[PDB]
Amino acid sequence: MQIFVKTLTGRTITLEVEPSDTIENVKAKIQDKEGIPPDQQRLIFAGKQLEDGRTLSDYNIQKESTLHLVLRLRGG
Amino acid sequence: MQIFVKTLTGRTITLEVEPSDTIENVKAKIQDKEGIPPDQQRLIFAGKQLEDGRTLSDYNIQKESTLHLVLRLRG
C-alpha cells in the first residue's frame, strides 16, 4: 500500500509499504529511496514518535496515511 | 571558526568551517559528519537559500552564526 512521508517544510514523497512492515523496515525504504541513513530518521504519526520494532498496523497507519520525517543529526 | 546548523525541530550541531568554504564544501562536511547526501541538503541563512558555488564570507556568515538545514527529498 501507499503512504506519504512529509517534512516540516511540506516536502513530500510516497512509499510502498505493507501493513506488517516495521518502522525499522520503513526507515530502510526511505534510505533506499532518498539516501538518508535510518539512524538519522525520526518518524512521527499522529503527533507521536514511532518505535523501530513496531509495525505500521500497530500505529493504525493505513493506505494514504501521512507520516512526518525529521532529522536526528545523530552524528553530532 | 564554528557555526551552528539547526533543524526545524531545534536539533542543533556545530560545524568547524572557514569563511572561504563554499556552500558545496559545507554540505560535503555535513555529509561527512551525518551521512546526509548533499543533494538532500537545503541550507538557509537569514531567509536565503544558499547556493553551492558561493562562500560563507560571500553570504556574510560569521563566527557563531546559525543557519538552517532542511530536507529536499528529491533523491
Numbering used by the authors:
A (entry chain A): 1 to 76
B (entry chain B): 1 to 75
Tell me, in the authors' exact words, what the paper reports.
We crystallized K33-linked di- and triUbs. The K33-linked diUb crystallized in space group I4, not observed previously for Ub, and a structure to 1.85 Å resolution revealed eight molecules forming four identical Ub dimers with clear electron density for the K33 linkages. In this structure, K33-linked diUb is compact, and distal and proximal Ub moieties interact symmetrically via their Ile36 hydrophobic patches. The symmetric interface did not provide a model for the conformation of a longer K33 chain. The distinct conformations of di- and triUb could be due to differences in crystallization conditions but highlight the underlying problem that crystallization may present an incomplete picture of the dynamic states of free polyUb in solution. Although the diUb crystal structure has captured a compact conformation of K33-linked diUb, solution studies suggest open conformations for both chain types without formation of defined interfaces, as reported for chemically assembled K33-linked chains (Dixon et al., 2013). We assembled K33-linked diUb from 13C, 15N-labeled monoUb and measured 2D band-selective excitation short transient transverse relaxation-optimized spectroscopy (BEST-TROSY) spectra, revealing well dispersed peaks similar to monoUb. The small chemical shift perturbations (CSPs) in all split resonances could be attributed to the proximal Ub, whereas the distal Ub was unperturbed. Mapping of the perturbed residues on Ub revealed a small region surrounding the isopeptide bond at K33.
During ubiquitination, the 76-amino acid protein ubiquitin (Ub) is attached via its C terminus to, most commonly, Lys residues on substrate proteins. Ub has seven internal Lys residues and an N-terminal amino group, all of which can be ubiquitinated, leading to the formation of polyUb chains. For the remaining four chain types, linked via K6, K27, K29, and K33, very little is known, and proteins generating and recognizing these chains in eukaryotic cells are still elusive. We found that the human HECT E3 ligases UBE3C and AREL1 assemble K48/K29- and K11/K33-linked Ub chains, respectively, and can be used in combination with DUBs to generate K29- and K33-linked chains for biochemical and structural analyses.
